[PDB]
Design a protein around this ligand. Structure first.
Ligand SMILES: [Mg+2]
Ligand SMILES: [Mg+2]
Ligand SMILES: [Mg+2]
Ligand SMILES: [Mg+2]
Ligand SMILES: [Mg+2]
Ligand SMILES: [Mg+2]
Ligand SMILES: [Zn+2]
Lengths: 110, 153, 148, 246, 174, 166, 99, 295, 289
C-alpha cells in the first residue's frame, strides 16, 4: 500500500522524539577501584580484562612455542613462573613456562 | 509458546548446535579459558560441567570414554581430560566452571560476550568482582549487630 | 488582517487635550532635489507654501535639504520620538499640502488596529454590576436551606 | 552516479620543489644571535650602585677587541652612527614596539621589530588583551657589546648591538573572555633584560630593529599565574606498569 | 544529584550476607510462630451463622493433578491446592468498601523482604507478618469478619462442598 | 558550504571592569563530514544535552552507537582545547550547553531493484556541533506543582475583563 | 475573504451579544426583553442596544430606573386596553411632538 | 547576659568571618605549591596549586568529577585532611572513599559529621526560653550502634523525656538540614579566640581547654556549616548532602554528681552505602539500645 | 547574472534593515543626529506649549552640571583655553530648586483646595507621587525635554531628567507669572492622576487603624464588621462581602476572596469615602479662571 498523503514534520517529530525512541541513561556506571577507569557493575573492567587477556596471550604463545606440534597436549599440570623465580616443592612434576617479564602485581603466587 | 524449554536454538539446527557446542568445549578443554558470545557460553557451561563429571566417572568406563571421544574433537585432549582436569576436581561437586560477562565486542556487531574458565588453571586470574570489606561503615554496623546477637545468645 | 498584525487600545499622548492641546508634530524634514524631475512637486511646495505652513504651525521645526536624491522624502518626527517617513515622489503641490497637513494633524501613535473606538478611565459611575447588585437580602443572612 | 569529494588538504614538500625555486629568498634578518652575550654572574648586587656598574660596563665594552672591530665595521658601513645616543634610540624602539603590541598595530610592529621577534611576541598573544604601560626607568639602558657577521655567499653583513636594560613596567594580560589572567595593572615590577638589535648594513634603508631578548639564567622566576595548573602523568597502555621515580 | 542504582547485596560483605540471611529467616520464623494462636490473644467476637452469610476464602498453590476413584467405579481427576501460608492482612468496612459487604484482604505465600517496595514492607512491618506474594480481596458479610493477622488453613473447607477457583490462566502470548 | 562554528571561537571580549561577575568560558567545537546519519547522531546529541562533560563521556563510553565514539572524541578534543587555549582551569568544570547534529554533503549512487528498475541511494554525511560552558550544570526543570498550577489558574481567572462591554 | 465576511458578521455578532446582555439584565429586573424594548420605545426613549447594554453593565441604578419606566408604560398600556376608554390617558403614555 | 539566640548566632558568625579574613590576609602574595598525587588510580600526577587557597577538592576538580563525587577524605602525606581545608605546603595527596580497603578514617569523619549535625539540630530544635548547652560529641567507635551527642537542658526540663513524636520531629529537622547543601568549613584558631567565640557554654569552654592543653601551640580546630559553629576532633565530610539516611534513634539521661547529661543517639548512612529497609530497621533497633564509650 | 541596479539597491536596503534588526546600535542624541538646530528647537519648545519663555533662561535651564564637567574634561584633554565663556555657563541648579519648591507648593495648594478632608500625610504622598521619578520622567520624555537637555549619557538618568524638567518649570516661573506657571503645572502634572486611585499612590499599611483614627477624630466610636453577602465558603475561590457599620449604619462595604481581605477592602472604601476620593467624585476642573 502507498501512503495517501505526505506526513508532516509535526507528526514526524511527535513520532521520533517520543521517550520510547530516545536513548535511556545508564545508572549502573562506576569507577574501577584498581585502575580508576569506568566500568559497569555487572561487567568486568575493560582495562583489567585487556591486561589479563594480553598476559594470557603471551603465556599461551610461550607454551605453544614450547611444543613442537599442534596435537602435543600436556598430560600433567602446568605452572607459569617469571624471572627470578624457581619452582617450589609442590610445583615439581609439572610442566613449567618461564617468562622474562617480572611477576605482575595482580598475578598472585598461589 | 516455549514454556519449559531449556535449550536455545543455535546454528542451522540441532546438529549444528551440537557441533558448535563441541567446538567450544574442545577449545575450553584445550585452553582452560575461552571467550565467546554470552548465549553460547551459557549453553556450553552445563556441557562443560557434565564433561568434567564424565571425566571423574573414570578412564576405564566405556560410556565415559566414548562420550569424551565424541565431544573432544581433538583426540589429544582426552588424556588431558582424564588425567589433568578430573584429578584436580575430586572434592568438588559442581563448581568446575566460572562464567563472567565481559564488555561487548569492539567491532560493529556489539555482541554480548562472556568468558568461561575451568577453575584452578595456570592462567592469570580474572578481575573477579570482590565484595566490600568488613571495615566499611555498613559492614561494621552489621558486625556490631552480630556481636550483640552472639553476646545475647 | 487583524489576527496577523498588531493592535492597541485608543489612547492619547500624555493626556493630550485634557488641560491643553499640544501639537504632536515636532519636526518635519523635507529631502528633495534641485534638478530631478521627480522633485518638481516638492520644489514647488517649498517655493510656495512651506512658509505659510511654518507660520501656521509655530510648534514644528521645518528643515529643507536640497541634495542629489532620486526620490524626495518627508520625515515627520513626533513628541513620542516616533518617526514617520513618507515619499513625495511625483506628487502635485496639492497632494504635498494634503500629506503635510495629515502628518501635522496625526498624533504620531502607531497606525494599527484599534481595539475599541473609545477609551475612558473609571467608567463605573454609581457602581459596577456584580451578581449581588440586584439580589434582595434575607433576615439574618440565612442560606436557602439553613435553619437558625 | 559516480561523483566524488574533493579538497583534501595535505602539505607535502620535497627537496626537488624546495631547491627548484628560480629566485632565492631575500631575508631581512638572521636565524639567531651569533656570539650570544653571556652576562656576568653578579649583576643584582652591581645594579644597586651606579658608578661601580657603569664604569665596569664601559670598561668591558671598550676593552673587547671584537666589539671594537665590530663597531668600526658598522661605522664604516653606515656613517653618522654613535654608541653614545644608541641607548636612547634602543629604549624608544623598545617602548614603541611594546605599545604597538598593546594596540595590535601589526604593520608598525613589523617596522619596529624583526622577523625573529614578531612571532615570539604575537603568536600566543593574538587572542588575548594586553594593557602594557611604561612608568619609569631607574637605570638608563647601557650598550654591552657589538657583534658583526659577514657572509660571503651573498656578500651581506649583519650587525647586532646588545643593550642591557633595567626598567619598570605595569603588565596586565587579559583573557579572550575579558577576565584577568597574568597580573594586576597597577603593579610596577622591575625587570632586567638584554635587548639585541639587528641591522642590515648592506641594505640602503637598514632600519634598526629589535631582534632578540636575552634573560639571565639566574634571573628571578616570573610572577606566578592566577590560576592552577594540572600536570598529568604518563598515559599508560594496559601493557605498561607505572614506574615511580625517586 | 545523579544517584546510582542499588540492591541489598551490593554493599554487604562475604560474611554479612549469611548473617543477614539467617537474621531475616529467624525473624520470619518468629513472626510466623507468633500467629499460631489467634483465638487466645484477642479474637474478634464470633457471630452465629445466617442464611445470607458469606465466608472468607484462601490463597493456595496449585501443586498438580491426581487421579481419584469413586465407590461406584467412576474415575475423576482432582487438583491439589496447597495452603502454604495464608493470612488475613487488613479489614475494610462494608460502608467504606462496597456498601453491601465488608472486604477482607488475604495474603498468600511468603516472599523475600529484599525485593519489595518501601510502602509494602512498612505495611507488613506494622501488621507483624513477612511479606506475601499474592494479595486478594474477599467480599464477606459483617458477621463473618476475622481479625487481621489470623492464619487460615485448608480445614476451612470440608470434604463435600463446592468452591470457586480464581486464577490467572496460562498465558500463550500474542 | 557554511563554516561559522569555527569562527564563533575567535571572538574577543573587552576586559571586565572590577566588580563585574566573572564571565563563564564558552568553547565551540565541531566535527565535519561524519559518515554516520543525521537523525541517529541527533539522538546521541539530545542524549548528552545539558549534563556535565564527565557524565556525558560516561554515557558515550557505554553507548553502543557508532556515533558515540565520534561524539566522545569531539568532547575530549573540546575539553583539551578548553584547558589549553582558553583560560579554563578545572577540566571537570564544563557542561554541554549545546549539542546538535546537522547534515552535510551527500553522495548519490544507484540502488538496483529488479525488472531493470533502480533507486537513488544517498550516502549520508553529518556534522556534529558541541558548545561547552564553564561551570556546574544548570538544574533540570521540575514538573509544575499543584500549588503553581492553582496559582496560574487563579491569576488567569483574575485577568478576565468584560469584553465588548464599555 | 474570511476577513471581509467576518467584518460583515461582526456587527451582527455584537448586536446579538448586546441583546443577550439586555435580556439578562431585564430578566434580573423581572421583565422580558421584548416588553422592555417596546415600552422603552413607547416612552420615546431612543437608546440603542449598545447603550442599553453599557448601562446594564456599568449603570445598574439607571438600568433599574429604565426597567421601572418600561414596566410602568406596560401597565398603562394594559389598563388602557382593558378600559377601552378615550378619556383616561396614562401619565407616561402621552406623546410629545417635535418642537 | 541579655542576648537573643539569633544575636548570639550572628555575632558568632561575624567573629568566625573576621578570623577567616585575618587568616587569608596573613598571606599577602600567591605562592605556588607542587602537590603530587599518590593514588593507585592515576599516579604521577602533579598539581601546581595555590598556597592557602587551593583545596584537595580543587585537586579533585582538576582530576575528574568522579573524584569530587566519590572522594570523601584526603591523606596529605601524614594525616586525614578534609576536602574544604586549604593546603599549606608542597605535599602528596591520596583520596579516600567509603569503599576503600581501610575506610576507618572516612568512617570516623562521617561519624563526627553526623554527631555535629545532631548537635546543631538539638540546639536549634528547642524552645528559646529553655537553656540548651551542648557539652561535646563523644568519640564512640563505629562498631557501636549509634553516634552520640551530649547536651545539658534547663533545670525545669529534668522531669520529662522526649517521645516518639519529638524524636520524629528532630529527624524531620535533620533531613531538612540534609536537603540544603551546607559545606563543612574548618579553621585552625587559638584558645584566646575560642574562649571569646564561645564565651557562654561552660562545658564547651572546658572541652576547648582540654583540647588546647595537649597542643603545645594551643591550637584548636573549629568546624562550621551554615550558621552553626562547633569544636570537634579530626576532619569532617565535605558536604552535608552526603548523609542520605538519618534518624534520631533515642535520648538517654545520665545523672552524675555535678549534673545530668542527655546523650542523644542517632543513626545515619551515606548515599554511597544506603541499606535496605529491613537492614536499616534492624540497625535502628540496634541503635535504640544504650551505648557507653568514653575511654 | 541578472542585469540591473534597482534590485541590488533594494537588497542593500534589506541587508541594512537585517543588520539593524540583528545588532541594534546604542541610542544616539537627537543633537548628534543630522537635522538639528538648537535655537529653532528652543523656540519651538517654547511655542508649542503656548507659553512665552525667555530664551536665555531656557538655555541656562537645559544645561546640567554633568555636561559642564564633561566639557571641562574635554577642554583639559584637548589642551586649549575655554574659561572665558564656559565659566559663565549658568548651570540650572538654582532654577531647578526654585522649580521644585514652587511645584511642591502649588500641588499642595491644589490638593488642599480640592480635597479638604485629605490629611497632610495623604496630600504629601500625592505630591511626592506627582513630582516623583517616574511621572516627571515620563512627562519630560513625552514633552521632548530630554532631546533639548544638554547632558552627557544620552539616556539622561532619571535624576537628571527630573532636574531638567523642574529647571524648565523654574524658568517658566521666572519668565511668566505664578498663575500661568500654576496653570502649566495643572495641565502637565495633575493630568497624570487621571484614572488613578488614592491608595495606589498612598500605599498605607493598616487601613482599619487609619479608619478608626479618622473616626475618632470625627467623633465616631468604632466600626463593626459584618458579613453582608457571601457566595461559597468551602470552595477554592470564595467571595465575601464585608460591611462596616457605625451605630448600626452602613458606611462602606467591600468584596474579597477571604474575610480578612474583604474587611481590609471595606476599610479602604470607608477611608476613600471619608477623604473624598470616591470613584464618582467631581472630575478635576480644567478651565481658565
Ligand atoms: Mg540464528
Ligand atoms: Mg508464556
Ligand atoms: Mg538485468
Ligand atoms: Mg531518498
Ligand atoms: Mg524520492
Ligand atoms: Mg455596510
Ligand atoms: Zn579496572
Amino acid at each position: 500500500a502507498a501512503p495517501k498523503n505526505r506526513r508532516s514534520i509535526e507528526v514526524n517529530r511527535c513520532r521520533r522524539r517520543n521517550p520510547q525512541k530516545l536513548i535511556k541513561v545508564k545508572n549502573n556506571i562506576d569507577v574501577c577501584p584498581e585502575c580508576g577507569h569506568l566500568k559497569q557493575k555487572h561487567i568486568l573492567c575493560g582495562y583489567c580484562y585487556e591486561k589479563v587477556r594480553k598476559e594470557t596471550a603471551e603465556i599461551r604463545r610461550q607454551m605453544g612455542k614450547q611444543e613442537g606440534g599442534p596435537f602435543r597436549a600436556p598430560t600433567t599440570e602446568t605452572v607459569v613462573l617469571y624471572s627470578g623465580e624457581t619452582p617450589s616443592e609442590q610445583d615439581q612434576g609439572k610442566r613449567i613456562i618461564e617468562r622474562e617479564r617480572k611477576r605482575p602485581s595482580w598475578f598472585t603466587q598461589n | 509458546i516455549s514454556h519449559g524449554r531449556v535449550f536455545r536454538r543455535l546454528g542451522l539446527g540441532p546438529e549444528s548446535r551440537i557441533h558448535l557446542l563441541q567446538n567450544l568445549l574442545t577449545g575450553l578443554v584445550r585452553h582452560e579459558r575461552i571467550e565467546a558470545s554470552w548465549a553460547r557460553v551459557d549453553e556450553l557451561r552445563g556441557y562443560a560441567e557434565k564433561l568434567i563429571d564424565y571425566g571423574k566417572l573414570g578412564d576405564t568406563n566405556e560410556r565415559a570414554m566414548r562420550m569424551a571421544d565424541f565431544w573432544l574433537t581433538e583426540k589429544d585432549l582426552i588424556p588431558k581430560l582424564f588425567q589433568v582436569l578430573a584429578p584436580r576436581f575430586q572434592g568438588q561437586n559442581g563448581g568446575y566452571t566460572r562464567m563472567l560477562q565481559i564488555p561487548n565486542r569492539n567491532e560493529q556487531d556489539r555482541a554480548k560476550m562472556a568468558v568461561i574458565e575451568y577453575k584452578g588453571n595456570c592462567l592469570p586470574p580474572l578481575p573477579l568482582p570482590r565484595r566490600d570489606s568488613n571495615l566499611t561503615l555498613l559492614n561494621q554496623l552489621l558486625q556490631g549487630l552480630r556481636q550483640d546477637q552472639e553476646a545475647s545468645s | 488582517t487583524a489576527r496577523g498584525t498588531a493592535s492597541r487600545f485608543l489612547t492619547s499622548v500624555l493626556h493630550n487635550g485634557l488641560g491643553r492641546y499640544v501639537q504632536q508634530l515636532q519636526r518635519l524634514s523635507f529631502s528633495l532635489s534641485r534638478d530631478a524631475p521627480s522633485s518638481r512637486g516638492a520644489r514647488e511646495f517649498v517655493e510656495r507654501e512651506v512658509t505659510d505652513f511654518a507660520r501656521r504651525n509655530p510648534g514644528v521645526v521645518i528643515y529643507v535639504n536640497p541634495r542629489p536624491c532620486c526620490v524626495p522624502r518627508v520625515v515627520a518626527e513626533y513628541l513620542n520620538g516616533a518617526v514617520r517617513e513618507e515619499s513625495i515622489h511625483c506628487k502635485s503641490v496639492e497632494e504635498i499640502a494634503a500629506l503635510v497637513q495629515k502628518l501635522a494633524d496625526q498624533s504620531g501613535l502607531d497606525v494599527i488596529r484599534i481595539r475599541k473606538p473609545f477609551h475612558t478611565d473609571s467608567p463605573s459611575i454609581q457602581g459596577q454590576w456584580h451578581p449581588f447588585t440586584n439580589k434582595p437580602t434575607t433576615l439574618g443572612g440565612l442560606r436557602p436551606r439553613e435553619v437558625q | 552516479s559516480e561523483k566524488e569529494f574533493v579538497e583534501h588538504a595535505r602539505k607535502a614538500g620535497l627537496v626537488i620543489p624546495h631547491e627548484r625555486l628560480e629566485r632565492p629568498i631575500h631575508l631581512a634578518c638572521t636565524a639567531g644571535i651569533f656570539d650570544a652575550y653571556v652576562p656576568p654572574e653578579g649583576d643584582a648586587r652591581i645594579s644597586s650602585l651606579s658608578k661601580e656598574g657603569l664604569a665596569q660596563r664601559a670598561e668591558r665594552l671598550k676593552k673587547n677587541v671584537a666589539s671594537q672591530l665590530s663597531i668600526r665595521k658598522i661605522r664604516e658601513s653606515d656613517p653618522n652612527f654613535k654608541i653614545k645616543d644608541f641607548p636612547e634610540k634602543a629604549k624608544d624602539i623598545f617602548i614603541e614596539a611594546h605599545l604597538c603590541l598593546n594596540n595590535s598595530d601589526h604593520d608598525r610592529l613589523h617596522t619596529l621589530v624583526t622577523e625573529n621577534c614578531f612571532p615570539d611576541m604575537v603568536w600566543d598573544i593574538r587572542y588575548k588583551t594586553v594593557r602594557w604601560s611604561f612608568v619609569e626607568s631607574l637605570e638608563p639602558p647601557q650598550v654591552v657589546q657589538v657583534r658583526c657577521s659577514s657572509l660571503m655567499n651573498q656578500g651581506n653583513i649583519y650587525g647586532q648591538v646588545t643593550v642591557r636594560m633595567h626598567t619598570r613596567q605595569t603588565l596586565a594580560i587579559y583573557d579572550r573572555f575579558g577576565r584577568l589572567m597574568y597580573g594586576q595593572e597597577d603593579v610596577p615590577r622591575d625587570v632586567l633584560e638584554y635587548v639585541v638589535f639587528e641591522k642590515h648594513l648592506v641594505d640602503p634603508y637598514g632600519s634598526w630593529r629589535m631582534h632578540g631578548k636575552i634573560i639571565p639564567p639566574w634571573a628571578p622566576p616570573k610572577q606566578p599565574i592566577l590560576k592552577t595548573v594540572m600536570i598529568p602523568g604518563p598515559q599508560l597502555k594496559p601493557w605498561e606498569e607505572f614506574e615511580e621515580p625517586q | 544529584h545523579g544517584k546510582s542504582v542499588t540492591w541489598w547485596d551490593e554493599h554487604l560483605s562475604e560474611e554479612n550476607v549469611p548473617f543477614v540471611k539467617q537474621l531475616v529467616s529467624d525473624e520470619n520464623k518468629a513472626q510466623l510462630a507468633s500467629k499460631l494462636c489467634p483465638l487466645k490473644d484477642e479474637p474478634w467476637p464470633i457471630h452465629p451463622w445466617e442464611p445470607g452469610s458469606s465466608r472468607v476464602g484462601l490463597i493456595a498453590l496449585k501443586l498438580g493433578m491426581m487421579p481419584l476413584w469413586t465407590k461406584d467405579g467412576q474415575k475423576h481427576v482432582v487438583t491439589l491446592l496447597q495452603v502454604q501460608d495464608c493470612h488475613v492482612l487488613k479489614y475494610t468496612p462494608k460502608e467504606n468498601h462496597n456498601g453491601r459487604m465488608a472486604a477482607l484482604t488475604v495474603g498468600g505465600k511468603t516472599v523475600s523482604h529484599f525485593h519489595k517496595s518501601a510502602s509494602i514492607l512498612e505495611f507488613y512491618q506494622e501488621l507483624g507478618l513477612p511479606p506475601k506474594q499474592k494479595v486478594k480481596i474477599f467480599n464477606v458479610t459483617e458477621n463473618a469478619v476475622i481479625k487481621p493477622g489470623t492464619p487460615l488453613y485448608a480445614a476451612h473447607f470440608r470434604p463435600g462442598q463446592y468452591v470457586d477457583v480464581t486464577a490467572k490462566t496460562i498465558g500463550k502470548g500474542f | 558550504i557554511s563554516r561559522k562554528w569555527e569562527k564563533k571561537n575567535k571572538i574577543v571580549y573587552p576586559p571586565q571592569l572590577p566588580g563585574e561577575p566573572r564571565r563563564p568560558a564558552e568553547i565551540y567545537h565541531c566535527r565535519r563530514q561524519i559518515k554516520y546519519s543525521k537523525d541517529k547522531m541527533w539522538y546521541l546529541a539530545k542524549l548528552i544535552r545539558g549534563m556535565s562533560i564527565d557524565q556525558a563521556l560516561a554515557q558515550l563510553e557505554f553507548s553502543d552507537k557508532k556515533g558515540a565514539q565520534i561524539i566522545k572524541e569531539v568532547l575530549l578534543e573540546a575539553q583539551d582545547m578548553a584547558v589549553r587555549d582558553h583560560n579554563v582551569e578545572f577540566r571537570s568544570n564544563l557542561y554541554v550547553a549545546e549539542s546538535t547534529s546537522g547534515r552535510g554533503q551527500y553522495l548519490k549512487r544507484i540502488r538496483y531493484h529488479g525488472r531493470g528498475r533502480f533507486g537513488i541511494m544517498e550516502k549520508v554525511f553529518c556534522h556534529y556541533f558541541v558548545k561547552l560552558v564553564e561551570g556546574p550544570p544548570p538544574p533540570r526543570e521540575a514538573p509544575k506543582t499543584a500549588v503553581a498550577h492553582a496559582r496560574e489558574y487563579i491569576q488567569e481567572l483574575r485577568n478576565r475583563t468584560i469584553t465588548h462591554a464599555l | 475573504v474570511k476577513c471581509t465576511r467576518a467584518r460583515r458578521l461582526k456587527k451582527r455578532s455584537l448586536r446579538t451579544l448586546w441583546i443577550n446582555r439586555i435580556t439578562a439584565a431585564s430578566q434580573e429586573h423581572g421583565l422580558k426583553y421584548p416588553a422592555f424594548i417596546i415600552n422603552l420605545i413607547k416612552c420615546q426613549v431612543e437608546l440603542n442596544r449598545k447603550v442599553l447594554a453599557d448601562l446594564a453593565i456599568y449603570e445598574p441604578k439607571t438600568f433599574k430606573s429604565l426597567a421601572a419606566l418600561a414596566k410602568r408604560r406596560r401597565e398603562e398600556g394594559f389598563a388602557a386596553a382593558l378600559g377601552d376608554g378615550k378619556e383616561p390617558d396614562g401619565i407616561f403614555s402621552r406623546v410629545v411632538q417635535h418642537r | 547576659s541579655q542576648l537573643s539566640p539569633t544575636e548570639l548566632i550572628e555575632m558568632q558568625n561575624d567573629l568566625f568571618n573576621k578570623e577567616k579574613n585575618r587568616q587569608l590576609s596573613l598571606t599577602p602574595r600567591t605562592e605556588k605549591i607542587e602537590v603530587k598525587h599518590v593514588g593507585k588510580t592515576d599516579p604521577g600526577t602533579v598539581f601546581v596549586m595555590n598556597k592557602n587557597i587551593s583545596t584537595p577538592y580543587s585537586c579533585a576538580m582538576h582530576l575528574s568529577e568522579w573524584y569530587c563525587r566519590k572522594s570523601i577524605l584526603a591523606l596529605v602525606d601524614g594525616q586525614p585532611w578534609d576536602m574544604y581545608k586549604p593546603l599549606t605546603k608542597s605535599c602528596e595527596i591520596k583520596f579516600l572513599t567509603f569503599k576503600d580497603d581501610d575506610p576507618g578514617e572516612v568512617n570516623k569523619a562521617y561519624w563526627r559529621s553526623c554527631a555535629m549535625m545532631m548537635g546543631c539540630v538539638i540546639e536549634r530544635a528547642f524552645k528559646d526560653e529553655y537553656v540548651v548547652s551542648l557539652v561535646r560529641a563523644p568519640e564512640v567507635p563505629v562498631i557501636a550502634g549509634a553516634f552520640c551527642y551530649d547536651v545539658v537542658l534547663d533545670k525545669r526540663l529534668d522531669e520529662w523525656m522526649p517521645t516518639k513524636e519529638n524524636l520524629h520531629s528532630f529527624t524531620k529537622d535533620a533531613r531538612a538540614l540534609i536537603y540544603k547543601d551546607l559545606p563543612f568549613e574548618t579553621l585552625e584558631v587559638e584558645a584566646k579566640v575560642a574562649l571569646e567565640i564561645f564565651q557562654h557554654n561552660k562545658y564547651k569552654l572546658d572541652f576547648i581547654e582540654e583540647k588546647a592543653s595537649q597542643n603545645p601551640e594551643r591550637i584548636v580546630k573549629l568546624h562550621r556549616f551554615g550558621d552553626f559553629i562547633d569544636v570537634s576532633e579530626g576532619p569532617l565530610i565535605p558536604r552535608t548532602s552526603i548523609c542520605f539516611q538519618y534518624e534520631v534513634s533515642a535520648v538517654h539521661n545520665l545523672q552524675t554528681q555535678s549534673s545530668l547529661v542527655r546523650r542523644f543517639q542517632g543513626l545515619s548512612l551515606p548515599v554511597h552505602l544506603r541499606a535496605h529497609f529491613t537492614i536499616w530497621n534492624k540497625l535502628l533497633e540496634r541503635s535504640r539500645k544504650m551505648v557507653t564509650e568514653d575511654k | 547574472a541578472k542585469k540591473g541596479f534597482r534590485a541590488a539597491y533594494r537588497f542593500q536596503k534589506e541587508l541594512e534593515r537585517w543588520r539593524l534588526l540583528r545588532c541594534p546600535p546604542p541610542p544616539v542624541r537627537r543633537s548628534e543626529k543630522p537635522n538639528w538646530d538648537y535655537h529653532a528647537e528652543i523656540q519651538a519648545f517654547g511655542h508649542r506649549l503656548q507659553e512665552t519663555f525667555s530664551l536665555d533662561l531656557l538655555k541656562t535651564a537645559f544645561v546640567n552640571s554633568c555636561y559642564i564637567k564633561s566639557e571641562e574634561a574635554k577642554r583639559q584633554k584637548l589642551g586649549i583655553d575655554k574659561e572665558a565663556a564656559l565659566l559663565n555657563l549658568k548651570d540650572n541648579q538654582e532654577l531647578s530648586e526654585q522649580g521644585i519648591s514652587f511645584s511642591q507648593t502649588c500641588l499642595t495648594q491644589f490638593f488642599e483646595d480640592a480635597f479638604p478632608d485629605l490629611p497632610t500625610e495623604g496630600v504629601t504622598s500625592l505630591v511626592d507621587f506627582l513630582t516623583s521619578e517616574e511621572v516627571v520622567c515620563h512627562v519630560a520624555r513625552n514633552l521632548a525635554v530630554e532631546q533639548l537637555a544638554l547632558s552627557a549619557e544620552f539616556p539622561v538618568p532619571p535624576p537628571v531628567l527630573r532636574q531638567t524638567f523642574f529647571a524648565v518649570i523654574g524658568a517658566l516661573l521666572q519668565s511668566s507669572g505664578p498663575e500661568r506657571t500654576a496653570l502649566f503645572i495643572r495641565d502637565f502634572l495633575i493630568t497624570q492622576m487621571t484614572g488613578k486611585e488614592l491608595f495606589e499612590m498612598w500605599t498605607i499599611t493598616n487601613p482599619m487603624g487609619l479608619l478608626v483614627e479618622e473616626l475618632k477624630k470625627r467623633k465616631i466610636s468604632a466600626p463593626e464588621s459584618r458579613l453582608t453577602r457571601q457566595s461559597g465558603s468551602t470552595t477554592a475561590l470564595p467571595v465575601y462581602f464585608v460591611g462596616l457599620y457605625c451605630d448600626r449604619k452602613l458606611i462602606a462595604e467591600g468584596p474579597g476572596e477571604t474575610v480578612l481581605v474583604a474587611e481590609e477592602e471595606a476599610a479602604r472604601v470607608a477611608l476613600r469615602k471619608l477623604f473624598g476620593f470616591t470613584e464618582n467624585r467631581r472630575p478635576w476642573d480644567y478651565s481658565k479662571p
